[PDB]
Amino acid sequence: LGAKPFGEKKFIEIKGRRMAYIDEGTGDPILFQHGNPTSSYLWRNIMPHCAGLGRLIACDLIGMGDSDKLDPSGPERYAYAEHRDYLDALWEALDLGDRVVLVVHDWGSALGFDWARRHRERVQGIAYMEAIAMPIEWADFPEQDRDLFQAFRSQAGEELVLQDNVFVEQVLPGLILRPLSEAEMAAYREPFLAAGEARRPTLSWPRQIPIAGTPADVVAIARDYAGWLSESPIPKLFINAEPGALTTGRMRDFCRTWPNQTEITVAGAHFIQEDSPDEIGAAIAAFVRRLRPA
């Protein structure tokens, strides 16, 4: 597997803040976007498979990875809309061109799907896995994690996450089938070593998941890209997971109705990149080779 990151971290100022990202190679972008509570590090063993197939980019969401924190931070900070404003500006600053291939996961998919809907003419292909493909109901949420996430979305969330770093220390490992190494966990907890607001992004995210109609704004956004994706002819690669976690049941049933889509199944729960990186990288590279023929 390997715990070493892919390439060197680069920095650029956005909205008066500093954001970190990986940008290696030349040509049309193959954009990898992580979710909660990860960073660009999540794709370290996947991006290599796309070597020479394009400009390999992986951005650290604001307040995450090596990107700046948003002070003053609080319950109102790090909502989906705010993350979008920063990511939109970062992607604009990167001069991506008009033949972008998106590779998304978790909140990176909500952000990526929305961006794609808004810049559809610039999207050459979309590879996704364990994504937030549509608004859901509690019955659709994984049973084993249902109570905990309901707790995150309650006044108990602050103690769980800001004080005890539960999303990083409990959820993350709990949704990876193979044992992580000391170095791998170190890389994941690094941005959240300090108790308090430094960990706010990992609490604000679960409170943004479009479940049972709340929050209304994210539900509407997801409803929008869900409808669009179900009709868009843009080529797609759906990397299904077994047993999987988020993209199972009804949501998986929905994703499987999407047009011009190739699907493969790999072993894993939610953070499948840590369980089947080679299968995932190989599939993405093949997908790209078909989208960018000699």
Q: Which residues are annotated as a binding site for chloride?
A: 36, 107
**Strands 236-243 and 261-268: what pairing?**
parallel
201 binds Cl ion (CB under 5 A): no
Please choose which of Ca ion, Cl ion, none residue 173 contacts, taking the beta carbon within 5 to 8 angstroms, the exact cut-off set by kind. Answer: Ca ion
Which burial class, exposed, middle or buried, applies to 62 when counting CB atoms under 10 A from its CB (0-12, 13-18, 19+)? buried
CA 254 to chain centre: 19
176 binds Ca ion (CB under 5 A): yes
Shortest distance (Å) from residue 141 CB to Cl ion: 11
Count of Cβ atoms closer than 10 Å to residue 272 Cβ = 27
> Does the annotation mark 130 as catalytic?
yes
Tokens of 177: 């089938």
Please choose which of Cl ion, Ca ion, none residue 25 contacts, taking the beta carbon within 5 to 8 angstroms, the exact cut-off set by kind. Answer: none
CB nearer to Cl ion: give 203 or 284.
203
Helix and strand totals (H; E) in the chain: 11, 8
Of residues 5, 25, 48, 173, which one binds Ca ion by CB under 5 A?
Answer: 173
Tokens of 174: 């709990």
Sheet of 261-268: strand order equals 10-14, 17-24, 55-59, 29-33, 100-106, 123-131, 236-243, 261-268
Shortest distance (Å) from residue 122 CB to Ca ion: 10
Interacting positions 203-232 with Cl ion (CB under 5 A):
205-206
CB nearer to Ca ion: give 166 or 226.
166
Known binding-site residue numbers: 36, 107
Tokens of 186: 């170190």
Please choose which of Cl ion, Ca ion, none residue 244 contacts, taking the beta carbon within 5 to 8 angstroms, the exact cut-off set by kind. Answer: none
Tokens of 112: 């990526």
> Does the annotation mark 106 as catalytic?
yes
Shortest distance (Å) from residue 223 CB to Ca ion: 32
Shortest distance (Å) from residue 6 CB to Ca ion: 23
Half-sphere exposure of 252 (CA within 13 A, CB side): 19
> Does the annotation mark 34 as catalytic?
no
Shortest distance (Å) from residue 150 CB to Cl ion: 13
Tokens of 231: 């009709």
Of residues 36, 45, 204, 276, which one binds Cl ion by CB under 5 A?
Answer: 36
- Which of 28, 60, 68, 106 is labelled catalytic? 106
CA-to-CA distance for 107 and 105, rounded, in angstroms?
6
**Strands 10-14 and 17-24: what pairing?**
antiparallel
135 binds Cl ion (CB under 5 A): no
Does residue 43 contact residue 281 with C-beta atoms inside 8 Å? no
- Which of 34, 49, 83, 270 is labelled catalytic? 270
Please choose which of Cl ion, Ca ion, none residue 36 contacts, taking the beta carbon within 5 to 8 angstroms, the exact cut-off set by kind. Answer: Cl ion
- The SS3 call for residue 57 is strand
Q: Give the residues lining the site for Cl ion (CB under 5 A).
A: 36, 205-206
Q: Give the residues lining the site for Ca ion (CB under 5 A).
A: 173, 176
Residues annotated as catalytic are: 106, 130, 270
